[PDB]
Every structure is written in structure tokens, then in C-alpha cells.
Amino acid sequence: DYTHPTEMRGLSAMDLVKDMKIGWNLGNTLESVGGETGWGNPVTTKKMFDTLKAAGFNTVRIPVRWDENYIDANYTIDPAYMARVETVVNYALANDMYAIVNIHHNKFQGQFDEAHKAAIINEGTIVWTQIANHFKDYSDKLIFDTINQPRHEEDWVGTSEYFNVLNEYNAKIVPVIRATGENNAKRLIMVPTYCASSDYPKVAGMVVPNDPNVAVSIHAYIPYNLALNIAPGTPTTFGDADAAFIDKTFRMLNNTFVKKGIPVIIGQFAITDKDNLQDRINFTKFYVSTATAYGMPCLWWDNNNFGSTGERLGLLNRKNLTFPYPELVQAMKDGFN
Numbered sequence: 001d002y003t004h005p006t007e008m009r010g011l012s013a014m015d016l017v018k019d020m021k022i023g024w025n026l027g028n029t030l031e032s033v034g035g036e037t038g039w040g041n042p043v044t045t046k047k048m049f050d051t052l053k054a055a056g057f058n059t060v061r062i063p064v065r066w067d068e069n070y071i072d073a074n075y076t077i078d079p080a081y082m083a084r085v086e087t088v089v090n091y092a093l094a095n096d097m098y099a100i101v102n103i104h105h106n107k108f109q110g111q112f113d114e115a116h117k118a119a120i121i122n123e124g125t126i127v128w129t130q131i132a133n134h135f136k137d138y139s140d141k142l143i144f145d146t147i148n149q150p151r152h153e154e155d156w157v158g159t160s161e162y163f164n165v166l167n168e169y170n171a172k173i174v175p176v177i178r179a180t181g182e183n184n185a186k187r188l189i190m191v192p193t194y195c196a197s198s199d200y201p202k203v204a205g206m207v208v209p210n211d212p213n214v215a216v217s218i219h220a221y222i223p224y225n226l227a228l229n230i231a232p233g234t235p236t237t238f239g240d241a242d243a244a245f246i247d248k249t250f251r252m253l254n255n256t257f258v259k260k261g262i263p264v265i266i267g268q269f270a271i272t273d274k275d276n277l278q279d280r281i282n283f284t285k286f287y288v289s290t291a292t293a294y295g296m297p298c299l300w301w302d303n304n305n306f307g308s309t310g311e312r313l314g315l316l317n318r319k320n321l322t323f324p325y326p327e328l329v330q331a332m333k334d335g336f337n
Contacts, residue, residue, distance in 0.1 A: 004090055005139035008183045013213045014295075016140065016188045017263035020098050022288075022332050023059030023299035024052055025268060027313065030085065031063035031104040031148075041304050042318050049091040051321045055329055060092040061267060061299050063104035063148065066127055075126045082134055093141055100190065100267070100299075101135075102145035103127060112165045112194070113152045121169055125176050132180040140183065145190040145217055145267065146173045158194045163205030166194055174209045190265055192217040198249050203256050216257050219268035221301075222246060227271045227283070230311060236276040238283040246290055254294040266291055270301040273312035273325075281331045288335025298332070 011019070032038035049060065062085070069081035085101065092099035103109070106127075108120040124147065135142055147169065152162045170191040178185050191209060193202040196219035208214060221228035223245045226235045235242075257264050271283045291298050306314045306324065315328060323329055 002090070002094055004086075005093055005141065006137050006183070007139040007141075008186055009140055010186055011140065013188055013215055014261070014263055016143075017215055017265060017297060018295060020265070020297040021058035022056060022336055023061065023098070023297055024057045024315070025061040025299050025301045026063065026088070027301050027303035028305070029063065030088065031065045033065075033068070035068065036084070044088055044091065044318075046091040046094065047321060048316065048318055049095050049097065052316060053095040053097060055316075055323065056333055057097065059098035059100070059297060059299060061100040061102070061145070062088055062092075064101060065105045066103060067106045067108075075123055075130075077127070077130050082130070086134065089135075089138075089142060093139065096141070098141045098143060100143045100145050101131065102148050102190075104148040109147060109149060110151055110153055112150045112162050112169070114161055114165060117165045117168065120165075121172050124169060124173050128173050128176055129180065132177045132184050136180050136182040136184045138183060140187060143188045143190060144177060145192070146170055147192060149195050149219065150192060151195050156195055156197070158197075158202060158205070160205060163194050163202065166192075167205075167207040171207070171209045174211045174214060178211070186213070189214050190217040190267065191215070192219075192267075195219075196267065198222065198253060200252065203252065208257070208262055215263045215265050216253075217267045218253065218264055218296075220249065220266055221269055221271075222249060226279075227269075228311070230272055234274070236274040236279060238271075238279040238286070242283070243286055246287055250290045250294055250296070253296070258294050258296070264294070264296045266296050266298040268301045269298055270313045277325065277327065280325075281327050284328050284331035285335045288332050290335075292336050300328075300332070 028039040069078045071078050089099045111120050150166050193206045198218050198220045223242050253264050271280045288298050302315045303313045304318045
């Protein structure tokens with residue numbers, strides 16, 4: 001009985017972004033090595049999305065690695081894999097939630113340099129032409145994100161050379177998507193800075209494509225030592241200096257992009273569990289409140305990890321569809337509203 005929605009309201013990027021609200025990433029799933037279950041998470045179900053919707057989420061980002069599912073030597077995507085991505089998109093769209101599809105951890109993600117520029121633009125063009133064509137009649141609640149964390153190797157600082165390669169990639173991919181037509185001519189497209197970083201050199205090095213319907217993609221697990229560094233002995237308290245760093249970063253993103261009419265989406269953020277629940281509540285409330293002041297939706301990175309090791313970023317326990325830390329969901333709501 002269900003058919004995918006096709007509605008195109010023709011909203012400006014600013015109006016679309018304003019409607020996105022509180023969000024969530026399907027982490028360590030379709031971007032895993034070995035497919036959906038390759039990093040130990042279960043097969044995704046609609047009931048998981050139903051649970052997120054009932055809890056107050058409105059947007060789901062769906063990381064997708066594509067390059068283990070090429071069926072030939074020219075980046076042709078297996079229809080069965082494309083169909084799985086579409087099924088998961090529809091778990092969100094059937095709940096009237098936004099769904100973001102990207103390229104995430106393809107090998108070329110780490111090849112944003114002059115030595116590989118022609119090859120990465122060619123692969124990205126061929127892949128995005130297929131994704132865009134497959135979804136061209138889909139409603140405006142489907143959003144595309146051109147590349148997850150583009151970089152050279154594991155250089156998270158970057159150089160102008162690499163920043164410029166990314167600018168050329170984004171400047172080619174956006175019109176490639178538009179030219180496939182139908183709703184893709186009017187769909188929001190997200191374009192990242194280098195590494196999707198909010199550090200000022202990446203922000204200043206960014207050239208947003210000459211397209212009036214794009215948003216900048218930022219991933220900001222900040223400050224790093226509190227929010228994402230999992231080493232023992234690292235900071236656990238959310239204090240004045242941490243809040244100040246977040247506020248400065250968001251004011252700067254507002255100055256560079258939002259005040260110039262270009263919206264920003266915080267496509268990933270979180271604070272890792274260091275057995276510091278109250279600090280995580282205070283962090284999350286502060287973070288979302290600050291982002292909301294500048295119209296930036298925040299999408300929590302949920303990897304379904306509730307164990308003792310690794311990046312402890314789970315919110316929805318996917319085994320039984322529960323929230324063991326409901327206070328963190330409530331903190332997002334309290335920051336947003």
C-alpha cells in the first residue's frame with residue numbers, strides 16, 4: 001500500500017533547513033566494511049525509525065559506502081544494493097522524516113588531492129548520476145550530501161591544495177545532480193568543508209558552489225578532548241571553556257555562511273559516554289541551543305554502541321528499541337524548543 005512520496009514544495013534552502021528540526025545518524029551501518037552488518041549492528045527496520053519519530057526526531061542521515069557494491073569496472077552500483085538504500089530511505093520517509101543519503105567511506109573520500117582529482121571527480125560524477133537518477137522523483141524530504149569527510153589520507157589539518165580539490169568536486173557534483181532533472185533540480189544538496197570541519201582554515205578555504213539551493217555540511221564533535229577523545233584520563237566535565245569554544249565556533253559559522261544566506265547543517269555531533277551523564281546532558285542542551293540560535297539543525301551520531309569500549313555514542317538501543325539515556329533526547333528537545 002505504501003508508495004514513496006513525491007511532493008516538491010519548492011522551498012528555499014533556508015526554509016527547508018528550518019523545517020529539519022532534531023536529527024540522528026544511522027551510524028556504523030551502511031557505511032561499514034562488509035555491508036550493513038559488517039560493524040556488528042543489526043539489519044535496520046522500519047520499527048527503529050518509528051521509535052525515533054515517536055521520540056521527537058525529524059531527520060535521519062544514512063551513511064552509505066558504495067564501492068563494495070560495484071558490479072563492473074566503471075562504478076556501476078548493484079541494483080540490489082541501491083534497492084536496500086532506498087528501502088531504508090523509505091523507513092524515514094514513511095514516517096514523514098527527512099532522509100539524507102551520501103557517499104561515506106568510499107576509498108576516494110581519502111583522495112582529495114591533485115594527484116587523484118580527475119579520478120575522484122569522475123567516480124563521484126558516475127556514482128551521483130546513478131543515485132540521483134534512481135531517486136529523481138522522490139519528495140523534497142530526501143536530501144543529498146555529496147561526500148562525508150573528504151580529505152587527503154589521514155591529514156585532518158589539510159592544505160589549500162586539498163581545499164581547492166574539494167571545491168572543484170563540489171562545483172561539479174552539484175550541477176551533475178541538477179541536470180538529472182525532475183525533483184533533483186529543486187532538491188537540497190549538502191556540501192562539506194574539508195573533513196566537514198568547523199576549524200577556521202577549512203571554513204575560510206571553502207568555496208560554496210554557485211547554486212542557490214545548497215547547505216554547508218559540518219561535523220563538530222567539539223571540543224574534541226571532551227566530546228570524542230575516548231582515551232582514559234581525558235576530560236569529562238562540561239565547563240566554561242568548552243561552552244566558549246562551541247559558542248565561538250557557531251558565531252563564526254553564522255558570520256561566514258548563515259548571514260550570507262547559506263544555511264548550515266550540523267550533520268554529525270555527539271558527546272561520548274565517559275560515565276558522565278550530567279555533563280553530557282548539559283553539553284547537549286548547550287550545543288543544540290547554540291546551534292538553534294543560528295538556524296542549524298543538529299544530527300546526533302548514533303552508532304548503537306552501549307558497551308565498555310570504543311566510541312560510546314549509542315542513544316537508541318537497536319536490539320530492543322529503547323532509550324537508556326532518555327535525558328539526552330530530552331536535552332536535544334530542550335535546546336531546540
